[PDB]
């Protein structure tokens, strides 16, 4: 499987996606997601200028050696641009390997551990009542799990060419959030899995406060409570609440969460394939997690392409310690650019049976949607302080 | 303070690749920051060109702290080599501007001088021990009081080197033996392990070299897992340095707080700039850790000039690495720092004292070049 060609495709069927494609001598090809929301062209350049030329002539069957070659060989290790490029290669190589094996990817990984992949939907509204209306609608679609967000008194996040500036007040939020969860439980009961994303805005003692306040609502998870570059940040939360915790969509390395996991400070690891060094790296993450009862909860936003979603569904299908799969539906244009054989049914994903990860890119269609810059917002406190979005 | 009127990158290859960021205010005052990331240069260039520069326009140039947080937190995806280098580039350019506006060389704005000169070390690399010894001699004559000694081990795209840990461990002590026997004990002797050992091997090496009293043993082992340094520290009193591959205080917070290293090596260009490195040096000071800035040729004279200003002020200065740039590189980046008798003297001109000759720079187009990779004798892709 000597690599004849490799290149990136950049497209915007409703939002930006970057994709690496690798083509071997026998015409066997694989694609990997390389999308990094708000910083897309950095990964495209990292790939186009520095990785791509090095892939020509390599044996595409050597997945592990290529991963170490790119990770160690970069000299500068880890990081979002770095690991997303590496994940793109890794994802494409596993795609090729599965095709060469004549197997859908989940079979290659060790076979299926489950007959379907539970997901959760996004239920958002300006008021509690709107959110509740959303919960109803998604329950009717078959979803067993919902992420609930509402407005605090007093959707594509990367919504502006340059970062939009939002205002934040922690105390208003804390005083309001438990009210949402109580109303969700009042209307829908305890059968429903209910998730909330705190989205980095709290200090640990504040997140401890919240966690304790929402214990009577039995959240499936409380996600991204606090910025966690300092992993010890989760300690105070964990020591003060039994509300399950989730973190890691902003992580790109097992070194970002090793201590979180070993200390049992989280219940679910959120780092996905595209940002976490791909299949090769994520297997090691899931394995470590399994030693401590920690389960996978893959980030699955619009800003990871169907290539990642397809591969993630295969991964979800095999991995023993599967928790849940996030599902923010891509636009119809996006789905058309990325033909795939995974399917959604009654609140769950079903892995494809086609060899590879089951996803392709229609390059002719993708060319109809040129890149359009879009940045993630910033968050400021009411005094102007640049805060966490 | 004034608004940023323009910002752009310059990419030049006067002997090797450099990427540079320039920021220009309403008044026409300008500043520059190094953004060079060896072997991945265009990732940072694109990071800057497409995502950061457009957001700089109209910003108040005097708001260094706010711009740093804005880019660090606002990126959402935090930390990393490309990320933090891009942030360093902005930070350095903004400090350059603020020092100009204050009419002071950078070291004054940071708190003034703590020392009269900045000690450096020279690279003395030889194919053999003898070769190495000759380099030490010739740098001693240039006035260097400290030398980094390396010898070969007997028996566009990335070069691929072969490596033998056991051969290196049996050989290295002989190098230091010979250096000490010829040059005596006054000289500071440094050695760079360059990532190739496991911790118990590095502990072995550390013990073996105790009799030769090295200034430091550097980058013993890959340290994404900061606990990797613990076994070394518990088995040897040979001083340890690490950090040129780091880009964040979170890459080294535990190494420092646990007193596992003596010198932190992360430089301005890759460690998020002046703003970030002040925080790292402050943490280091609490635990007797001193700065030992990475100073290869792949960090531009822009970085070196700013590092020298930093070195001049920082209380817990250790040493400054010096790999002299080529003549053409020096011409492309005019500067007022000077090397004398083994030490640097900071510039006295306002800003960090480095400029870029854009006309000259445009004469040297980018030329792709990659860092080598290492493989064991069995083919295993190892740490370079
Ligand atoms: O959990 C989530 O889905 C959110 O945190 C993401 O939609 C996130 O805001 C975007 O992926 C940012 O790129
Ligand atoms: O200490 C040193 O001088 C070396 O480790 C560096 O030259 C390093 O190998 C390169 O600068 C990385 O680009
Ligand atoms: Cl990065
Ligand atoms: Mg989230
Ligand atoms: Mg070094």
Q: What angle separates helix A80-101 from helix A306-318, to the nearest 10 degrees?
A: 70
For B81, the token pair is 């080599």
Question: Quick check: B40 and B81 in contact, CB under 8 A?
Answer: yes
Query: Given ligand 2 and candidates B221, B298, B303, which is best to mutate, with the most ligand atoms within 8 Å of its CB?
Result: B298
**β-pair partners for A160:** A375
Can you tell me whether residue B46 is helix, strand or coil? helix
Give CA separation, B274 vs A1, B92, B284, B295, B350, in Å. Answer: 47, 6, 15, 15, 16
Structure tokens at A182: 């109580």
The domain locations on chain B are 1-105+349-384, 106-348
Q: Minimal CA–CA distance to A96: which of A66, A51, A134?
A: A66
Largest CA distance in chain A: 61
How many residues in chain B? 384
How many helices, marked H, and strands, marked E, lie in chain B?
Answer: 14, 16
Strand, helix or coil for residue A76: coil
- Write out the two tokens for B137: 């001699």
CA distance B244 to chain A (A): 9
Q: Is B172 helix (H, G, I), strand (E, B) or coil?
A: helix
Breaks in chain A after residues (C–N exceeding 2.5 Å):
154
The secondary element (H helix, E strand) that includes residue B8 is: strand B4-12
Three-state DSSP class for residue A66: helix
CB A253 within 8 A of CB A81: no
CA–CA dist B211, B200 (Å, integer): 19
Instruction: Give the active site residues of A.
Output: 199
CA B179, CA B174: separation in Å to the nearest integer? 9
Q: Are B221 and B198 in contact (CB under 8 A)?
A: yes
- What are the start-end ranges of the E strands in B194-280? 216-218, 240-242, 263-264
To the nearest whole Å, the CA of A58 is away from the closest chain B CA by: 12
Residue A352: burial class (beta carbons within 10 Å; 0-12, 13-18, 19+)? buried
Identify which of B54, B73, B158 has the shortest CB distance to residue A73: B158
The three-state secondary structure class of B374 is strand
Strand partners of residue B194:
none
Q: Whose CA is closest to A147, among A129, A124, A126, A170?
A: A124
CB B90 within 8 A of CB B52: yes
CA A229 to chain centre: 18
A327 and A363 Cβ atoms separated by less than 8 Å: no
Q: Strands B343-345 and B338-340, how do they pair?
A: antiparallel
Mutate to test the interface with A, among B9, B41, B76, B272 (most CBs of A within 10 A): B76
DSSP alpha helix (H) spans, A241-375: 258-262, 278-291, 306-318, 332-337, 363-366
CA-wise closest residue to A265 among A220, A225, A300, A298:
A225
Q: Are A222 and A254 in contact (CB under 8 A)?
A: no
Pairing type for strands B160-163 and B146-151 reads unpaired
Q: Name residues whose C-beta falls within 8 Å of residue B377's C-beta, 6 or more positions apart in sequence.
A: B162, B163, B164
Cα dihedral value B65, B70, B73, B75, nearest 10? -140
| Contact by Cβ (8 Å): B95, B64 | yes
CB distance B14 to B83 below 8 Å: no
Provide CB contacts within 8 A for A101, sequence distance 6+: A107, A108, A355
Q: Is the CB of residue B172 less than 8 Å from the CB of residue B213?
A: no
Pick the CATH number of A105-353 from 3.20.20.120, 3.40.30.10, 3.90.1300.10, 3.20.20.450: 3.20.20.120
State CA B346 to chain mean position distance.
17
Q: Hey, what are A340's tokens?
A: 């795939």
Assess contact for A60 and A22: CB atoms under 8 A: yes
CATH superfamily, domain A1-104+354-389, is: Enolase-like, N-terminal domain (3.30.390.10)
* Distance (Å, whole) CA A38 – CA A27: 33
Query: Treating both helix axes as pointing N-terminal to C-terminal, what angle do A128-140 and A170-188 enclose, rounded to 10 degrees?
Result: 40
Spell out the residues 6+ positions from residue B195 whose beta carbon is closer than 8 angstroms to its own.
B219, B220, B221, B222, B245, B383, B384
Question: What is the per-residue DSSP string for B267-327?
Answer: -TTTTTHHHHHHHHHHHHHTTT-EEEE---TTS-HHHHHHHHHHHHH-TTEEEEE--PPPH
**Residues A354 and A340 sit within 8 Å (Cβ to Cβ):** no
**Spatial distance between the Cα atoms of A191 and A362, rounded to a whole number of angstroms:** 41
Q: Return d(Cα A202, Cα A206) in angstroms, integer.
A: 6
**DSSP-derived 3-state class of residue A320:** coil
Angle value at C-alpha A354, between A349 and A359, nearest 5 degrees: 70
Q: Under DSSP, is residue B366 helix (H, G, I), strand (E, B) or coil?
A: coil
Instruction: Report the C-alpha gap between B205 and B222 in whole angstroms.
Output: 16
Pairing state of beta strands B240-242 and B263-264? Answer: parallel
Q: Please tell me the distance from the alpha carbon of residue B343 to that of residue B325, in angstroms, as a whole number.
A: 16
Q: Is the CB of B20 under 6 A from ligand 2?
A: no
Which strands sit side by side in the sheet containing A3-11, from one edge to the other?
A3-11, A17-24, A29-33
Distance of CA B271 to the CA centre of its chain: 9
Specify the residue for token string 């990475």: B294
Integer Cα distance of B49 and B69 in angstroms? 19
Residue B43 DSSP SS3? helix
How was this model experimentally determined?
A: X-ray
Class of domain B1-105+349-384: alpha beta
Tokens 């020092």, located at residue: B99
Report the SS3 class of residue B40.
Answer: coil
Q: Is the dihedral of CA A188, A190, A191, A192 positive or negative?
A: positive
- Determine which residue's CA is closest to atom 10 belonging to ligand 1: A301
Q: Cα-Cα-Cα-Cα dihedral of A365, A117, A251, A247, to 10°?
A: 140
Q: Is B367 buried (19+), middle (13-18) or exposed (0-12) by CB count in 10 A?
A: exposed
- Rounded-to-integer distance, Cα B136 and Cα B183, Å: 9
Q: Tokens 């030693």 belong to which residue?
A: A291
d(C-alpha A103, C-alpha A97), whole Å: 9
Mutating to test ligand 2, I would choose from B294, B369, B371 the residue with most ligand atoms within 8 A of its C-beta, which is B294
Q: Please answer whether residues A158 and A375 qualify as being in contact, where contact means their C-beta atoms are separated by less than 8 angstroms.
A: yes
Tell me A47's DSSP state.
Answer: I
Among A77, A99, A187, A355, CA closest to B82: A77
**Rg value, chain B, Cα:** 21
In 3-state terms, what secondary structure has residue A375?
strand
The reply to whether residue B46 touches residue A50, judged by beta carbons under 8 angstroms, is no
Please say whether the beta carbons of B140 and B147 come within 8 A.
Answer: yes
**Angle, to 10 degrees, between the axis of helix B301-313 and the axis of helix B81-102?**
70
Contact A194, A181 (CB under 8 A): yes
Cα–Cα distance, B92 to B357 (Å, whole number): 17
Give chain A's radius of gyration (CA, Å).
Answer: 20
**Cα–Cα distance, B104 to B347 (Å, whole number):** 10
Strand, helix or coil for residue A31: strand
Identity of the residue in A77, A250, A386 whose CB atom sits nearest the CB atom of B77: A250
β-pairing, A268-269 with A245-247? parallel
Q: What is the CATH T-level fold of the domain B106-348, as seen in this structure? A: TIM Barrel (3.20.20)
d(CA A152, CA A176): 6
Compute the distance from residue B265 Cα to the ligand 5 centre, in Å. 8
Q: Which of B188, B194, B213, B235 is catalytic?
A: B194
H or E segment to which residue B373 belongs: strand B373-376
Closest by CA position to A174, among listed A147, A209, A149, A199: A209
> Is B337:B305 a contact under the CB 8 Å cutoff?
yes
Torsion of CA B329, B330, B331, B334, to 10 degrees: 130
* C-alpha distances in Å from residue A141, one per residue of A65, A351, B30, B383: 44, 19, 58, 50
In this structure, what token pair is assigned to residue A172? 């208003």
């Amino acid at each position: 499987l000597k690599i004849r060609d490799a290149y990136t495709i950049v497209t915007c069927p409703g939002r930006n996606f970057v994709t690496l494609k690798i083509v071997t001598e026998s015409g066997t090809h694989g694609i990997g997601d390389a999308t990094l929301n708000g910083r897309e062209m950095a990964v495209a350049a990292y790939l186009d200028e520095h990785v791509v030329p090095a892939l020509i002539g390599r044996d595409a069957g050597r997945i592990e050696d290529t991963w170490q070659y790119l990770y160690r060989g970069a000299y500068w290790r880890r990081g979002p641009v770095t690991m997303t490029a590496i994940a793109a290669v890794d994802m494409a190589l596993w795609d090729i390997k599965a095709k060469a094996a004549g197997m859908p990817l989940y079979q290659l990984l060790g076979g299926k551990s489950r007959e379907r992949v539970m997901t959760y939907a996004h239920c958002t509204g300006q008021t509690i009542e709107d959110c509740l209306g959303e919960v109803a609608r998604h329950v009717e679609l078959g979803y067993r799990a919902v992420r609930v967000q509402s407005g605090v008194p007093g959707y594509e996040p990367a919504d502006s060419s340059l970062p939009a500036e939002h205002v934040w007040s922690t105390e208003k939020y804390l005083n309001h959030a438990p009210k949402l969860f109580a109303a969700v439980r009042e209307r829908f009961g305890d059968d429903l899995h209910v998730l909330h994303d705190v989205h980095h805005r709290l200090t640990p003692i504040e997140a401890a406060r919240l966690g304790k306040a929402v214990e009577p609502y039995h959240l499936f998870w409380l996600e991204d409570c606090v910025p966690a570059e300092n992993q010890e940040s989760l300690r105070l939360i964990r020591e003060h609440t039994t509300t399950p915790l989730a973190i890691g969509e902003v992580f790109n390395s097992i070194h970002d969460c090793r201590e979180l996991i070993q200390n049992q400070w989280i219940d679910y690891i959120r780092m996905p394939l595209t940002h976490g060094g791909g299949i090769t790296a994520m297997r090691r993450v899931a394995d470590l997690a399994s030693l401590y009862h920690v389960r996978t909860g893959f980030h699955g936003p619009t800003d990871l392409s169907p290539v990642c979603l397809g591969a993630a569904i295969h991964f979800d299908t095999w991995v023993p310690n599967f928790g849940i799969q996030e599902h923010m539906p891509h636009t119809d244009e996006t789905d058309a650019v990325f033909p795939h054989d995974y399917r959604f049914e009654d609140g769950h994903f079903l892995a494809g049976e086609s060899p590879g990860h089951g996803v392709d890119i229609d390059e002719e269609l993708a060319a109809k949607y040129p890149y359009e810059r879009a940045s993630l917002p910033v968050n400021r406190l009411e005094d102007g302080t640049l805060w966490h979005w």
